[PDB]
Amino acid sequence: REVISIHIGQAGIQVGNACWELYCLEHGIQPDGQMPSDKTIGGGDDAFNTFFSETGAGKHVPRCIFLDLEPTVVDEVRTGTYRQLFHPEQLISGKEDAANNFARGHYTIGKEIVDLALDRIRKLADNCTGLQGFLVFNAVGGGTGSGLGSLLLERLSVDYGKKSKLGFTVYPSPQVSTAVVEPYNSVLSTHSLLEHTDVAVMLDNEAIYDICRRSLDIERPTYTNLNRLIAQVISSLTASLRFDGALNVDITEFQTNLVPYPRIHFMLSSYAPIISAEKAYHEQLSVAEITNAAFEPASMMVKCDPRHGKYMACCLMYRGDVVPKDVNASVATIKTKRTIQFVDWCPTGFKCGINYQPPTVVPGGDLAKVQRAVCMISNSTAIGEIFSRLDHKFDLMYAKRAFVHWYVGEGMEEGEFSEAREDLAALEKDFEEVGA
Amino acid sequence: FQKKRRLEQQLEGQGKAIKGLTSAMGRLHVDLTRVNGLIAANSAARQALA
Amino acid sequence: KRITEQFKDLQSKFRHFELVDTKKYKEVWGMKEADVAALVRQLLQADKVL
Amino acid sequence: KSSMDAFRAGQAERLKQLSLASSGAMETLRGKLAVAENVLKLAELARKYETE
Amino acid sequence: MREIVHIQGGQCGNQIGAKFWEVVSDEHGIDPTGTYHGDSDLQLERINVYFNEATGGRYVPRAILMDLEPGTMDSVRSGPYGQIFRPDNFVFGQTGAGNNWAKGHYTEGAELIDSVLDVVRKEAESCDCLQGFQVCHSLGGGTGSGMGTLLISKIREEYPDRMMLTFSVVPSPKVSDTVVEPYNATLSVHQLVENADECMVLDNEALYDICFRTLKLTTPTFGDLNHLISAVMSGITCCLRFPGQLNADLRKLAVNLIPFPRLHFFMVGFTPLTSRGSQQYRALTVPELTQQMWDAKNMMCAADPRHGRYLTASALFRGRMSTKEVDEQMLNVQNKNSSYFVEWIPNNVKSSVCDIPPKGLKMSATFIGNSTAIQEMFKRVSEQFTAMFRRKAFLHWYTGEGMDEMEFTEAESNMNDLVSEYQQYQ
Amino acid sequence: MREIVHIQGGQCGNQIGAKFWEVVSDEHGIDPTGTYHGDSDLQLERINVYFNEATGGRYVPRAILMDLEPGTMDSVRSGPYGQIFRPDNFVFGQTGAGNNWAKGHYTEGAELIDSVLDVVRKEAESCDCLQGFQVCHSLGGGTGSGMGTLLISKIREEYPDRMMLTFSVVPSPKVSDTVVEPYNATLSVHQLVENADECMVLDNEALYDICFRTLKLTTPTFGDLNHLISAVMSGITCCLRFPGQLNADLRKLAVNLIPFPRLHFFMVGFTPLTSRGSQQYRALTVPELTQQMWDAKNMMCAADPRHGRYLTASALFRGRMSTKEVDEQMLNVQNKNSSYFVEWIPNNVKSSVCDIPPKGLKMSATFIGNSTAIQEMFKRVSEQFTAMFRRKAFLHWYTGEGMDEMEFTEAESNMNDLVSEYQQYQ
Amino acid sequence: AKLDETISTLKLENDMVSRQVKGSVEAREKALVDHDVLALEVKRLRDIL
Ligand SMILES: Nc1nc2c(ncn2[C@@H]2O[C@H](COP(=O)(O)OP(=O)(O)OP(=O)(O)O)[C@@H](O)[C@H]2O)c(=O)[nH]1
Ligand SMILES: Nc1nc2c(ncn2[C@@H]2O[C@H](COP(=O)(O)OP(=O)(O)O)[C@@H](O)[C@H]2O)c(=O)[nH]1
Ligand SMILES: Nc1nc2c(ncn2[C@@H]2O[C@H](COP(=O)(O)OP(=O)(O)O)[C@@H](O)[C@H]2O)c(=O)[nH]1
Ligand SMILES: [Mg+2]
């Protein structure tokens, strides 16, 4: 029972550097692709087969694909600690970067390396037997992760179709702007992904800086800090497929329990408890505490107010010591809570799940090892504010026909600009309609 | 804030009414059982007297 | 055959529900109006004494 | 079945409105009676110190 | 010689049946290895009802095991009392219905019914005189309520004379654990009402409140809910397995509890339930057992049975006792609660006595009441169904794998008419 | 046959009842483990009046604790003989009484008394032929008077054919525990004189004077006071447990004592009460047990009978004695103290003899008088009430919980007319 | 900004508590209907007695 992850671009490969660290660390795999003979942590030999397949005599290789156009970060991870871990062909990279342009990364340069990437993924999938689905991690605000990212989404969809698609994009944040021309490659990829990928769980940057400032006190945090808890939420949502528990939820449960309408699929993720070692034992963790922390707005991967929205559905993974009674009591308290509202046509909306294995702490991190940990993925209508702000800033530059000459010279025209504008407007309209 | 406080007060009023009604239901259920017992006893007495 | 017998059962149930609901509503109104009549009799007695 | 549901709903609504209005009226009447009986009790207690 | 065939479906059904084949195997005194290690002989006399002796002395239960992921097969096999289920019965898919009735009733259930029917047919023909089929299956999933209902219809077709006991643990309104549970419950109850001989409805909010009030368990888990359900399910058949004074089989229960064809949705309870701290303060006397039985909070359904009127009821007492006080108590209960009893039936209660009480205890009792207060459990699920279908929520998932509006509209109509036919006698 | 249920309201009542149950267990010869380890069969002939056979000798008392805190409950469990009560009867809230009549009669009463009635009704229906009720409480607190008195009223309304003994520790002026003792005493006697059937009134002032003069104790903690109150409540009803030469049921005592339905407050004492030192010298025969019985300084009430007149007296002797000796004792006492007695009642003394003396002692006696000098306590408490009711002191803690001035005036008028009824006959 | 954000929270709170009050009203009505049903049953049994 395997799930194949694709990492695209700078953000994809950095989140990969964090995740494929966390998974190997949890399964006890040495950074050389082996497992020590003398000491064996408690687990099932089938547990690690969801990620790290075996190649011959005691050799483990991950099921994944890093791909990028630049050679810089890819040969950096090559030079890094994980040298023999990744198969030398699980690392696909061009020689000239897309340089922050959807058109350049999707037509001119995006039409050479995608064939090799797709061939490699196809052979790896055919090696895999029980492919649960495809998970994508990328940044929508860049060139390498956006253009050929959407190209690969389309090509995977036309190749398999029947296998689930779960994306994890990094939208531009409201105020912190890493790049300048970001909204272009954001909206252009939104036009595609709104109807190609099945379920999208969104991420942000300020929405995580604030968390690691308040609950972690790292006043000067960075991507190396954020990516670790990103890996943590990914692991805490795949834990049910990976390990064994009491109330399992496979990769189909998320889509079956959280996507009412085919064109209403956008998820807000949240993780509790985010706490450092200093407060870990000075505070008393419990199911009620962690659930209330998860459902307060300030502990969300996406900078948005759910109090301007109405929750449509939620999925709660739990790890470690979790009795299926305290979770029920806490979620009943949440339903009774006087702040978060529900859309009138969803009486039951809390898909829970439990796993025995508690979270694993990476050494040198800020998160402390804790008995339990939750992970809340919710389909809610408050996300429409994100796209509304995106359009409200997109038109300001689109009207002036500024920064468009790069795309038009590469070959695309303003017709698809207007198409993306109109379709994201329709998406906002659709959220407004479902809010009824 | 005035509106919120007033709505709260109405909420506790309704809760108190609910609890009182439940207490009355319990009392009436007990009286149901007692009355049915008396029915049975007097039926036996009627047969004996006949 | 299933839907025919279901039709017949539906007709019988319709008649039964009509009779039961009408009888119940009539009886409960009669009982509670007798109760309020007793209460107003008590009020009149109190007023006369005062 | 539509006729079924419509008729039963109508009966339920009429029972609802009857019960609610009747309960309100009884509460008002009981309040009046409680005031009256408090008055009578005060009169009863007061006439104890009255001389013959 | 009267054989019971036990069918377990999905994670929930599989765990419930794991506890069942723990309790009943202990009662007949077999070791976890599979070799008889009892002491008495009455427990050996009726091994056949729940076992098939095989060469080498390893008894094996007659229970079919169906699901769509090995993640439940191994969870129910590795656990205690797991190494006695016959490996040949281990029929399983490896896809996973995923809380969907369609995926488990029209495509993957459709392709697995062939093998599961082969297993059940060889099991039926390997025993001489069938007594009945009893299926312990959830109603909120898609591998227990999607494929289980199809298997139920298939068994009805292949043996249209055998009693059927559907231990169906229906969902809960407040205890929300899935978002399409109203769908996967209504669509299965629609097809269960027509082809089930008797339906024992269960729930988990009731089991939690019992494990709070009576057992006073601080941290009740599924290992306790399923244990209690196993106790009830092993108590339902005392006469077919042990001697007594007034026996009662599944046919007897159906005759004395089913006055109309569609009206066979019972509600179940067990006695005596008492905490370990108070095990030695109270008395196991027939008046106390009956007083506990005839309460409203002692039952295993969220419906408060004190709303409607019991059309009929059955009690199975087990222990050396006195039928005189048995009947006196269970007639005084009618004389004192005649309001909660329908008038046009005299002696609404059927009481039966078995001689041998269960292991550990000394005098046990099981309650199976066919009442009209069970309507309130289906009315809420119908309300949820109407609320969700009024906006066509999650409908694309169902209609993308063969489902049409026909099933949904029929389910709405028949839930409404079933609640109406329960409401009629009130 | 005949039996008595017991209730322990509040902390004072709970501790008094705990000592009472220790005394009764000692007299009947049972261990704190619940088993029987006495010597004779005359005690186990009639233990069903206070105990129930649970399972193989583990006798369980027929009493129910009742308060609003867990500390006292934990104390009684941890104390000796506290491991016998049924854990299903440890009913108790959590918020806190606040020593407030409103907080124990209008909010926590309304939130726990349905449950306390449920458990007491379960016990009263488990027992077959009821004889009465027994309750222990104090008339100076909030949950002592509120909880216990509302329970008294509800039980009187529900079983209005059973004799009722309420043992009330009335406040005494010198031992002034709290500030609202007169308020609580007034609001409690207002309901006792109207609903409950007889209260035995006791007071800490006399309970200390007895210990200082007769017992000659040095440091009497509450253990000795509760011991004396126990030894009184144990001998109040002995004709049930043990045979007697002239039996006397509780109803017989009530009908002989209470001349009019509103003069039912009993002032009680016990004999012999001999100091540990002078006991070895003292002589114990009937014409000195009776002398100490009518000794005005042995009365467990700060109301000297020489300040009033006797309406009726009851002397319950225990041990093998001479009935003619007892009768001549009573006759010559009446002729000696004719002045202290009412003219229009010939032979104001009712005498009873039981055949089994208490543990160790060879002869014993208990005195229960209905003297009209008991009006002193009510007069004093009414004076203390009106000292505060003129200025509405400490009254908002009841006004805010919802009691007017009308019921306060009602209760004070009730006390005044009760004092008038005692004084008029004298 | 602070005032308007607080105002939005207050409005959300007010509408949700109004929904809760309406639910309480419905529950109270249903309890009243059950109540007079039970009273009817009591009166009928009293008449039989
Ligand atoms: N939160 C977070 N964001 C990251 C991280 N790494 C990259 N990003 C995002 O990447 C964006 C920068 O553009 P890129 O995604 O690197 O562009 P690209 O996909 O590499 O394509 P090019 O522009 O041609 O290099 C920033 O806005 C970041 O939000 C990371 O580790 N954490
Ligand atoms: N009482 C009890 N309930 C269970 C158990 N396992 C699961 N459930 C409940 O049964 C409901 C439906 O489970 P289901 O989806 O059918 O599990 P599946 O077989 O994997 O599909 C869930 O809401 C669980 O809460 C169990 O062992 N005992
Ligand atoms: N005889 C006796 N009296 C006690 C004991 N403990 C407390 N008291 C009396 O009980 C009174 C306290 O009243 P309390 O029970 O707290 O009122 P409540 O809280 O409403 O029940 C004090 O005035 C004490 O004199 C005891 O062990 N024995
Ligand atoms: Mg790039």
Tab-separated table of C-alpha atoms in Angstrom, chain A residues 257 312-313 335 345-351, chain E residues 172-173 175-182 384 388 394:
chain	number	residue	atom	x	y	z
A	257	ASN	CA	-15.973	12.725	3.702
A	312	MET	CA	-18.642	22.628	5.660
A	313	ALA	CA	-16.695	19.567	6.831
A	335	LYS	CA	-20.304	21.673	18.045
A	345	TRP	CA	-27.344	21.231	5.293
A	346	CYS	CA	-24.483	19.383	7.039
A	347	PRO	CA	-25.690	17.778	10.281
A	348	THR	CA	-22.706	15.433	10.642
A	349	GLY	CA	-19.379	16.921	9.665
A	350	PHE	CA	-16.539	15.509	11.798
A	351	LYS	CA	-14.694	12.597	10.184
E	172	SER	CA	-25.828	8.110	16.418
E	173	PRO	CA	-27.036	11.709	15.989
E	175	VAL	CA	-21.906	10.907	18.193
E	176	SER	CA	-20.809	11.982	14.715
E	177	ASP	CA	-18.001	9.862	13.263
E	178	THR	CA	-18.763	10.154	9.526
E	179	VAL	CA	-20.429	12.704	7.262
E	180	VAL	CA	-22.390	10.331	4.994
E	181	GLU	CA	-23.550	8.006	7.765
E	182	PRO	CA	-27.207	9.046	7.176
E	384	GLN	CA	-30.649	14.176	8.394
E	388	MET	CA	-28.521	16.633	3.179
E	394	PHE	CA	-21.997	14.596	-1.544
